[PDB]
Every structure is written in C-alpha cells, then in structure tokens.
Swiss-Prot record:
It comes from the Eukaryota. The modification Phosphoserine is found at residue 22. It is found in: Nucleus; Cytoplasm; Cytolytic granule; Cytoplasm, Stress granule. The RRM 2 domain is required for the binding to target RNA, and the RRM 1 and RRM 3 domains seem to contribute to the affinity of the interaction with RNA. Expressed in brain, heart, kidney, lung and skeletal muscle. It comes from Homo sapiens. Residues 26-98 form the RRM domain. Interacts with FASTK. This is Nucleolysin TIAR.
C-alpha cells in the first residue's frame, strides 16, 4: 500500500466564498490559461458549474471573466476551479471586482 499525508486547511470554504463579496456583484475571475484561452472554453468549463451571463477571454493578458446570475453558482465554480489545471495550466478563480472609477484620495496601512 501507499501513503502520503501532509496537508491542512486548503482551498476556499463554500461558506467563506459565498460572502467574500456582496451578493449583488457575483463575478468569477479565472486566470491561468495562456495558449488555450477561448470563449467556448470558459463557457463550456463554467457551463455546467452554473449559468453564465458575460464572458471575457484575454489571451493577451492570460486571464478571463465569468459572471453568474447568482452568487451561489459563482461560489461553487470558484471553490472548485480555485486550484484546477485546465489543459495543463493552473487557473485561479477569484471574485471579479469592478475597478474603482471614482474615489480621489489614496491610502495605506
């Protein structure tokens, strides 16, 4: 028989992901692919994971966007995709947050 145990606390808990960001804004930032980024890919990949609203593939930056109609579905695909290898390329699933358009006044801490 074989053995191999040396891990503790990994990935992201569904309860943690389904809260990180407001329930109103549900986005999934999938970054990793470089020589295999295609709308059909992300669509088919998240297709089942849940319902997809908008998809943006950036084969020049090495990342893509995927927003769901709900927070749950998004969290599911995230908790999973978060640490998966597509076509031999590790991808990262995050909560696509809208960039700050207006704010004025930097900070630090």
């Amino acid at each position: 028989g074989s053995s191999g145990s040396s891990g503790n606390t990994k990935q992201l808990r569904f309860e943690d992901v389904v809260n990180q960001s407001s329930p109103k804004n549900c986005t999934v930032y999938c970054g990793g692919i470089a020589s295999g980024l295609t709308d059909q890919l992300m669509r088919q990949t998240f297709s089942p994971f849940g319902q997809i609203m908008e998809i943006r593939v950036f084969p020049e930056k090495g990342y893509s966007f995927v927003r769901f109609s709900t927070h749950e579905s998004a969290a599911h695909a995230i908790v999973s995709v978060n640490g998966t290898t597509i076509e031999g390329h590790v991808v990262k699933c995050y909560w696509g947050k809208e960039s700050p358009d207006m704010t004025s006044g930097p900070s630090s801490g």
